[PDB]
């Protein structure tokens, strides 16, 4: 069976309880995770140890908190107490866990399931070939010996409009923002990097990225996490918003792909 779970955010107990509810069995089943494995919840260290141990039984995409953890580890960014990352950063296997984490994808594609995953979704300004190339380019910098320079460069809110002509720092920043921070778009597909509200709470003319017809969404189902204020609701056919806010006191959601059946684990608080 194939299971897809939204942002875990260090909620190790809820993750394991949900996997036991569906009797997840590595070697028979595959787990897809929308990223943001770490921060806010208490068990980021246990989450990373477990997800790394799954090997080929898990298909991960990196989220914005996963990249932020890497930036803290590399001395690029300051550790925020609220993120609760210190046990992971101080662990004796921190190097092993985080060198594994930075090698993971930003984008997963299964052609037989006609299924795409990324943390925030797929901007409507990208076709599939472009999304693949952009994921490959950022994955290459993150997996390289020089990844702290990219982590430092990734911070920024501009440019917010895609063009194949983008080069350099702006190209990489846009790619990172589209895969890991996107929520709202302007009508022309341009990213808005400020509003984090629900679609009904947002100011005009902002619309969800998935409300703008895009070439990927026209041919593939898209699963994503990230947008907790969406509460997993309000999406069109073929768009699966899996982040129901476990770390915020919401729920952890798991979708089984074969029958589109949902399983939910309440937050422990
Ligand atoms: Mn998140
Ligand atoms: Mn996120």
Curated annotation (Swiss-Prot):
Co(2+) is a strong stimulator (100-fold increase in rate of hydrolysis). Mn(2+), Cd(2+), Ni(2+), Mg(2+) and Ca(2+) are weak stimulators; the two latter act synergistically with Co(2+). Its EC number is 3.6.1.41. The keyword Transferase does not apply. InterPro entries: ApaH, Calcineurin-like_PHP_ApaH, Metallo-depent_PP-like. It comes from the Bacteria. The keyword Iron does not apply. GO terms for cellular component: cytoplasm. It catalyses: P(1),P(4)-bis(5'-adenosyl) tetraphosphate + H2O = 2 ADP + 2 H(+). Hydrolyzes diadenosine 5',5'''-P1,P4-tetraphosphate to yield ADP. Monomer. This is Bis(5'-nucleosyl)-tetraphosphatase [symmetrical]. It comes from Escherichia coli (strain K12). The gene is apaH.
């Amino acid at each position: 069976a194939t299971y897809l779970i939204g942002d875990v955010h260090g909620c190790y107990d809820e993750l394991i309880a949900l996997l036991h509810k569906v009797e997840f069995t590595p070697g028979k089943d595959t787990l897809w995770l929308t990223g943001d494995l770490v921060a806010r919840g208490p068990g980021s260290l246990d989450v990373l140890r477990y997800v790394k141990s799954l090997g080929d039984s898990v298909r991960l995409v990196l989220g914005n908190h996963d990249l932020h953890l890497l930036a803290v580890f590399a001395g690029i960014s300051r550790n925020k107490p609220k993120d609760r990352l210190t046990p992971l950063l101080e662990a004796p296997d921190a190097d092993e866990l985080l060198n594994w984490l930075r090698r993971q994808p930003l984008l997963q594609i299964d052609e037989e399931k006609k299924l795409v995953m990324a943390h925030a979704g797929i901007t409507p300004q990208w076709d599939l070939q472009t999304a693949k190339e952009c994921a490959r380019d950022v994955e290459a910098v993150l997996s390289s010996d020089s990844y702290p320079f990219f982590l430092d460069a990734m911070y920024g809110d501009m440019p917010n409009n895609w063009s194949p002509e983008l080069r350099g720092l702006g190209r990489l920043r846009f790619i990172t923002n589209a895969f890991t921070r996107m929520r709202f778009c302007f009508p022309n597909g341009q990213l808005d990097m400020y509003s984090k509200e629900s679609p009904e709470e947002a100011p005009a003319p902002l619309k969800p990225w998935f409300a703008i017809p895009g070439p990927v969404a026209e041919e593939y189902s898209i699963a994503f996490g990230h947008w907790a204020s969406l509460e997993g609701k309000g999406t069109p056919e073929g768009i699966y918003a899996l982040d129901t806010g476990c770390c915020w006191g919401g729920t952890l959601t798991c979708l089984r792909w074969e029958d589109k059946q949902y399983f939910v684990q309440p937050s422990n608080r």
